[PDB]
């Protein structure tokens, strides 16, 4: 099936308090594999996955350098942007970058990404063709000009289409057991009630991987969307996810509701009844 | 551009030395390489920016610092024969689109066990062949610089007091004249071809000049022969008509 | 992170084609490029190639990448005598690390219109053997006897191009006659 590798960088300026806090994490699918934090002790790219631990010292040396490059680039950007918008020296602001590639089931190139965001809002992103840019405001346009002039897109394209892909395959292959797996959700249902007329019916999905899942309550066969409390998919902490939907049911109506769980690990979609 | 001083340097095992590298292009990244016959260039240390420094492939023996974005000085704390090489400084500005690296001119460095090894050159020109003049109508003068150590030399030809470039050909690298020896003397030859007509004119004066880079005005020298200091040693010839 | 440039030397007649090959190790190299170096000067950027392209060309220079074999190349067509230089194949591991190879000396030999080799004995202004006017085909062998010096062939230009190599020795009856013993023909003056 499809696969993807993504890197996420966050830099928050600390006016007065010191140099901007920089965190960088990389993921292959829903599994985090490498990291870096400016406030950590090592000042090196660290392995956060057992399969990456096997990588040579040159990898860690070479990756520590480049990641530190990413750090310096953002440190500069924070101020550059403070200027673009004409903001105060005293304000803490954020810069965020995400980039990655997706391979199909044939493990070949599919799509490349690269997005930059300043203060939680889109700033500039590379268009799907990996040749042009989408700049939000006037500032983004300045940067757009800079990057078109320095032919940045042409270098990212060679990274996304080539090196990003090549490495993902490597990771997938060395991390086979972990990465190339599908843990279907272990479902079940609970019944809570603190009153003599209403009982809350909660449907669960635990120990599933990847994180993509669709959990839905229905009454007599009618989507129960607006009357359902759905919690955001949450990590278990061991490499799997959790999730749950809950509806308030008037006593006697229990047999009317049905929970519907959809997930890659499930051959056929499940339907749980309170029986 | 990127400038680096000195051009040539001779040290005795144990002496410290600092190589200066200056770039006026506001480039943030600067590096130090060294070229040896067997292995192209190799990185010693590099600096991604003001206040930051990190080691490269062959960092042993050298220290480096970067208190300014303009300069990146390479220090040899106590010289050793192995550090005998040609050093190059480079700069680029990565975070701005300049990934392509720019190299300074390079500085030759030679380190000996004993400074009594340094010897200035003994240049001498050899006049054209009577046969050549007759046979081809051209006259080839040949300069011959010998006995010098270290091989730090610059040989130029001058006719009628003004330097000449045409017709001259000079060895790309000096040849060791005692290959079995560590402290060997070097030799260098060069040619200057002119027409027979030009050589046969007594008005023309030809002069092979060789500039030797040796000891400084501060280097210690307690010996009886003349201190092998930086100097120019020439030889000449006059337009004949045999 | 090794970049191997086998073949230290290469001579190609003027007008012909010169192809310099290169190989590398780490799969972590993302940019490939070539540097040309003149004597007594620093290396100059010559041409690049992105990790994804196969060929690239800036007038006369064409670079070929073949990641499957981890081999890069440079074709100089048509080669001119000004091209003689040591060409260094390089690769970066990010934009803050450059890795060079051993380099290869390219010697583009000029075409000699009307040659006539000869060894002449020249005497001090106050004897050295000059082997000149030969064809860029003749290689020039070095010293055989440790007490006799022979220089490596060079080319001199006039605004006429000639090939010359010098031989000298502080021996008794060392004579031009023998001096350049290994590969040549004609004109041993009297």
């Amino acid at each position: 099936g499809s696969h993807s590798m993504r890197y996420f960088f966050t830099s928050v300026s600390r006016p007065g308090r010191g140099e901007p806090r920089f965190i960088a994490v990389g993921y292959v699918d829903d599994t985090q594999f490498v990291r870096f934090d400016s406030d950590a002790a090592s000042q090196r790219m660290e392995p956060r996955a057992p399969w990456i631990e096997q990588e040579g010292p040159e990898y860690w040396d070479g990756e520590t350098r480049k990641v530190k490059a990413h750090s310096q680039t953002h440190r500069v950007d924070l101020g550059t942007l403070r200027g673009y918008y004409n903001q105060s020296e005293a304000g803490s602001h954020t810069v965020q970058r995400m980039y990655g590639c997706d391979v199909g089931s044939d493990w070949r190139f599919l799509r490349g990404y690269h997005q930059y965001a300043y203060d939680g809002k889109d700033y500039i992103a590379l268009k799907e063709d990996l040749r042009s840019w989408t700049a939000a405001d006037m500032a983004a346009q300045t940067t757009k000009h800079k990057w078109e002039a320095a032919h940045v897109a042409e270098q990212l394209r060679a990274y996304l289409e080539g090196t990003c892909v090549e490495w993902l395959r490597r990771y997938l292959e060395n991390g086979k057991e972990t990465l190339q797996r599908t843990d279907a959700p272990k479902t079940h249902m609970t019944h809570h009630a603190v009153s003599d007329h209403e009982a809350t019916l909660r449907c669960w999905a635990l120990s599933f991987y990847p994180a993509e899942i669709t959990l839905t309550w229905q009454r007599d066969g009618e989507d129960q969307t607006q009357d359902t409390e759905l919690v955001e998919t949450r990590p278990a902490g061991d490499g799997t996810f959790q999730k749950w939907a809950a509806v308030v049911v008037p006593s006697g109506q229990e047999q009317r509701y049905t929970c519907h769980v959809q997930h890659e690990g499930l051959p056929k979609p499940l339907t749980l009844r309170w029986e | 551009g990127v400038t680096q001083t000195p051009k040539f340097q001779v040290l005795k095992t144990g002496q410290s030395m600092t190589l200066q590298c200056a770039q006026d292009m506001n480039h943030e990244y600067m590096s130090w390489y060294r070229q040896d016959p067997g292995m192209g260039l190799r990185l010693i240390h590099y600096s991604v920016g003001a206040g930051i420094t990190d080691q490269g492939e062959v960092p042993n023996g050298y220290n480096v610092s970067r208190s300014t974005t303009e300069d990146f000085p390479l220090r040899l704390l106590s010289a050793a024969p192995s550090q005998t090489s040609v050093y190059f400084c480079a700069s680029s500005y990565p975070g701005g689109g300049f990934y392509e690296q720019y190299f300074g001119p390079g500085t030759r460095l030679t380190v000996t066990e004993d400074l009594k090894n340094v010897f200035p050159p003994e240049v001498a020109v050899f006049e054209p062949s009577e046969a050549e003049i007759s046979h081809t109508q051209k006259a080839t003068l040949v300069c011959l610089a010998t006995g010098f150590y270290p091989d730090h030399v610059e040989l130029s030809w001058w006719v009628n007091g003004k330097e000449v470039h045409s017709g001259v050909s000079t060895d790309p690298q000096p040849l060791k004249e005692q290959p079995a020896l560590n402290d060997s003397r070097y030799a260098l030859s060069s040619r200057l071809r002119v027409s027979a007509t030009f050589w046969q004119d007594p008005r023309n004066h030809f002069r092979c000049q060789v500039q030797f880079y040796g000891l400084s005005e501060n280097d210690e020298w307690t010996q009886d022969r003349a201190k092998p200091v930086t100097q120019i040693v020439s030889a000449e010839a006059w337009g004949r008509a045999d | 992170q090794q970049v191997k440039q086998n073949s230290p030397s290469l001579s190609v007649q003027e007008g012909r084609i010169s192809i310099l090959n290169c190989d590398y190790t780490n799969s972590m190299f993302d940019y490939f490029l070539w540097y040309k170096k003149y004597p007594a000067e620093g290396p100059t950027f010559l041409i690049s190639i992105s990790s994804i392209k196969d060929k690239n060309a800036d007038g006369r220079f064409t670079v070929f990448l073949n990641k499957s074999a981890k081999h890069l190349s440079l074709h100089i067509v048509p080669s001119q005598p000004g091209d003689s230089a040591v060409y260094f194949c390089a690769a970066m591991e990010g934009a803050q690390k450059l890795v060079f190879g051993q380099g290869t000396r390219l010697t583009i030999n000029p075409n000699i219109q009307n040659p006539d080799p000869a060894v002449y004995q020249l005497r001090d202004s106050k004897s050295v053997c000059l082997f000149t006017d030969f064809d860029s085909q003749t290689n020039v062998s070095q010293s055989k006897d440790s007490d006799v010096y022979i220089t490596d062939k060079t080319v001199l230009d006039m605004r006429f191009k000639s090939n010359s190599a010098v031989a000298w020795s502080n021996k008794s009856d060392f004579a031009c006659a023998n001096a350049f013993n290994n590969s040549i023909i004609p004109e041993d003056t009297f």
Partner: peptide, 9 residues
């Protein structure tokens, strides 16, 4: 493997 040529905005 990370990208190797980030540029200032």
């Amino acid at each position: 493997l990370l990208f190797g040529y980030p540029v200032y905005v």
